[model samples]
Target: ANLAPLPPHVPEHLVFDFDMYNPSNLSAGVQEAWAVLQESNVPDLVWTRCNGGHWIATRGQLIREAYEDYRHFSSECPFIPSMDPPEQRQFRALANQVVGMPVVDKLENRIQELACSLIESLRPQGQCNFTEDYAEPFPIRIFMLLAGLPEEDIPHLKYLTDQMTRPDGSMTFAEAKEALYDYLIPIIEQRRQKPGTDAISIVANGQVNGRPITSDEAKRMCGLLLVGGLDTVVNFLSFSMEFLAKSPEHRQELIERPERIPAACEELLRRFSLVADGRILTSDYEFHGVQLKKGDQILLPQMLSGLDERENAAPMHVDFSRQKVSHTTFGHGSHLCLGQHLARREIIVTLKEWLTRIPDFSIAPGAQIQHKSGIVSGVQALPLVWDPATTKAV
Candidate 1:
């Protein structure tokens, strides 16, 4: 908790000591935890002296406006996606090529079989840790297949990925990330010399802005894909599933109307949206009657924007058929999430296939499900249970 003193540019009225890494009421719910800022008393944009002290936008309007107006709220930090405009476009294409609809679709929905395979393996067990058992494997297997990484390597890479996403005192975030890059660096070099039809190979032997990409550049790009691919998809599935496991009516609704699974997927993406990254201030500028100085980091919690009551009536309620679901779940503007299409497809597949086989499931009784708060909020584990005889063996 690097608590920095309040800057003179920031007024007393605007100060709110919030920590994006570990919000005060995180035990209630990750999204609910961030709703603290939107309360009438707290300013729509408030300053918090946690994690090196930064500004936070608490309303959907301000969040969208800030992201759209990237000129001032620059997403810069080479540890990253801080790539602005024309520079970001070329690299976006590299990642888009790997997980975009074309490649995502070319797989011909093997996602269904992959999902089906996972469910059947657990359907007979009646209980399993949903996050570790299903959430991680379902989408990750898709990523592994796309990247041409074998399944055996999952345990190795997943540990490094987890160390960064939900650290456990084993190593620092930067240390774990370096470990991820170190693992990829060799693979990046090997793929460059002898490439294949995989994500790593494509980025490894690809061009950028009409110039050949260097090894260093390829490693960062690959790291971007890996973190982007693994973290959100894995975390989101648990939140969505935990909600589904508790709300039996919602499960029956999807089961009764499978066609609406996609819509339900969208709603879940909103209700369970996760991922928050900050943008650096390009220069000192007055924004909405507030002084924002140069070199200040502003956290734009994508999870909070959707939870703002001003964004939607009864924001916490998950309405599958809502007329409009507004959110920065995939981010906003040109830098919108690159792997969204793959994520949406994976989610829709999981809902359809899981419900079809194990339609009746719930959280293990008396289990105290724990939630983690950070750049990527998540459930540590979800113990799901069902009656074996009440399941279908499709």
Candidate 2:
């Protein structure tokens, strides 16, 4: 990657040439690629020429500071639910009503039902591309069902989601964002005119603070929710599953003590943390002894916080029983993830069910598992195999 000319105030010591889109070590592991920043030689805050130049906060402390101080580190489209403090409460509460614990608690049965059915379907197959066969469909189906979107629209929706998260020059992110909106415009209109119990309906027709939500506001909010719903948990499952298949001992721990699964979900969430976008600087700011210019986009990667050794001893090791499981995987501060309740529900339910049914699965012999990184990181494919005899129980 060609280096962009360094800014006048940014000292050479803090300049680290890194690529958010395609890190040099990405083939090994995306998390591994990012951990290089936290190494001894690298400063706590570094600037990379990639992505039109941006700062990167290496430690959880810096990340947490940037997020909490939203005045300097402004958010336009922060999370899919990203907004600055001004109306974060209004939009956050509105979206929270749908994916919050109450709604997620209610989805328990449906989530469990979907997990069991999918696992049972694959039980007799002996082998399957877990990423395509299980990981992709499971959460996408769940989100689509939750939104009351048609089952038939998944392929089209997934395509749009992929472009935004992992664009391949086929479409600019702007085009992808518009296409997503254009697709949502009609659906949002319909849901507004005739609201239902679904998420889209709640978001489209709901009031914002004291005012009736406008079409534009609703579409933007719904758009972010849809993009995240389609992307986050889907890739995460593949990573979790891949780790399980490779580490049979880890599998045995969960199989024997299923009560530990919830904690394991948190531990795994910490270890496999993903999602790495940052805030745009509203004004010139000095963050952690480093001078940040107005409009500097500092990438406070949500994934790095958990992986840092400072946050957790032996951060990479998945200690399911660790009392202090620290992470900003969902996010941090006022912009914390609204759908986190749902994300955890899906995770806990999927792991609980999958291990109960297919406890003996493994990565197919000699088959390589590949990962692609971007705004979100994902496994390209995960081929899993298990003997039909072992997967069955009396």
Candidate 3:
């Protein structure tokens, strides 16, 4: 793709021209694809012509500062690189109703139960598509059940959610968003009429800032939850598993010392952290010596911040014993992921339980697991096989 003309006052050397949605820069992997931002000779802040020409914060220092400076970088769009204060604050508060710590704590027992049940069911299969069989079902089913939605809606809901992050290039963002709203409109209406213990009911009837929430607001907040629930851990587990299946030494460390699972989860989150969302600048201001204009979009990648060498020494390697494991895997500042507690629990439970049953599994022979790049990155399919004889029900 030919480069678009640089915006006025933008320097030529700072033009990286990498697309976060469909990065042509990716060859080694997703992390590497994002890591291109921090490579030697690349400016800390670079502008790309891809996807309407957005600026990128290549290092953790810049990413964290930008996220903290939400007044200038609005979250008003709330989808991919939009949103502003007051409104962003209000919407975030409503969103926390479902995914906040209290709900995650309440759902902790259910999450562990589901993880064990799913792993036990597949233990004897000897071979399974890890992505479809376990990864997708694990977090998604819990979310659907939490929302008081029917189990049958998984396929449709999942498709709509995926399209938002990894669009097929057919549907525009607005079209995809509208389709999701269409699916939730009826459900939100029903929940409002007859509220229940489900998450949707809580939001439908919930109040914020002493005012009753509108149906449109409910749909928008639920849309955020759906995207977070369906997309976040669904892809992450595969990245973690793909790495584990090939690393026997690391597997043995956890297999022998199970108590380290929590620490291991943190380390893995840093090494494989994924999630990238951008913000639209409100006014012209100088950012890190780079001239900017109002309405300029900047991709403050969550994945790249942790991978930055300055933040975590030797950022590429995964060391469970690392003392200061830090990264913006969930996010940073006011919009820090509300469902992080849930994500951590899911990751820990899956790792602990999966290893208990099928500890010796590996990637299928001659299988080339293709990685897909988008707003979120993930393995296309994880074909894992293990010996049934070696497995035991827990």
Candidate 4:
């Protein structure tokens, strides 16, 4: 097998097809895609003309390069067909500052405290549906409280954000985006008059360099925060629970030694690297050995590479004891997911608190966990079965 040749089975047309509407071939899909890159001996890169022409950086080493070399491969259009218009793009920049180094540093403690309190609440329950009861609410509520948003807005906003990412395609991307914008406009206006310490206020009233920020910028920035809170942590929590449920030995290990949850979280993220797609390319470029012209669309799904069977022993299995757990689950480079630390804290706390109470539980029978397509992937419902009578009163 020549490592440099694109598989004959992977047709040139299929290479350029946008898979947004089609369901992904989940079981072996991502592994298969990576195999194509491996079979081609894709040199640090390959070109996929899927949604639009774009580069597919496969190996962890090359993906790291693309993320680091933000010059050629920038974060501006990080997601495919990026879905950002001029005005929206301006808002995206505003939001980035909040999650950027400065704001995250300021809010670290508050985030940790929130994670602690949420986990503590469930410690006595012995059993609860994590997805509906805990995982979904914890992060979103924290973001709402931190943003100074009214608690009432959490449900509505969470619903809309879910639409944007895990949509059924009933609404066009533009329509769904505008719905979010509309929801945020009033909140931004309200915060401006009564500025407070929440993220929304800090962003709205505070200066970046030395200037008053505009309402539009505040709205967009807040929107980003809302989306950030809604997606990453929730999905991470779901995947972690599912992994632990399936591996009793691994769960037992975490239960006996809770400190290992953090390391285990990293490993689950490594092996279960949820896949996401990028948009169509807008220009022509000679990437790897392929000639990709402008208007060729491609999906550069960021699946876990280093954990592939060819790359690791039993790549699919969870192993907290593994010395170096390599992955791009938090993403890589300039657009590497910004909420990584907060997400980590939430998972570790939840895992510890969970095992402390219900050391063992199983997924509820007939509970149909589902995954939606988008830049983010996750389980919809994670019902678990465990008897609560055995727990002590708080």
Give all TM-scores, in the order shown: 0.95, 0.94, 0.93, 0.77
Which structure is stronger by lDDT: 2 or 4? 2
- Per-residue lDDT, model 1, residue 117, is 92
lDDT of each: 0.86, 0.85, 0.84, 0.62
Q: Name the 10 consecutive residues with the lowest summed lDDT in model 3.
A: 76-85
- Candidate 2's residue-wise lDDT over 179-294, tens digit each? 98999888889988899999989998878777778889988988877766757888899899999999999999999999999999999999988889788888988777888888
- At residue 178, candidate 2 shows an lDDT of 92
lDDT for 73 in candidate 2 is 84
Q: Candidate 4 at residue 336, lDDT?
A: 58
Order of quality (lDDT): 1, 2, 3, 4
- Which residue runs of candidate 2 sit more than 4 Å off their true CA positions? 77-82, 166-175
Q: Which ten residues in a row have the lowest lDDT in candidate 4?
A: 14-23
Higher lDDT: candidate 2 or 3?
2
Tens digit of per-residue lDDT, candidate 1, span 1-394? 4678898888988889888767889888888887888899998889988877788888888888888888888877411126799878888988888888898788747788889999999999999999989998876787787888898998888888879766789999999988888988899899989999999999998798788898889989988887787778888999999999999999999988888898899899988988787788899988899899998888887887788888878999999988888888999877899988888988998999899999999999999788887778888899999999999997
Error of 4 at 43 (Å): 8.8
| Candidate 1 weakest ten by summed lDDT | 74-83
What lDDT would candidate 4 get against the real structure? 0.62
Q: Which pairs in model 1 have colliding backbones? A: 75-82
User: How should the candidates be ordered by TM-score, best one leading?
Assistant: 1, 2, 3, 4
Select the stronger candidate by TM-score from 1 and 4.
1
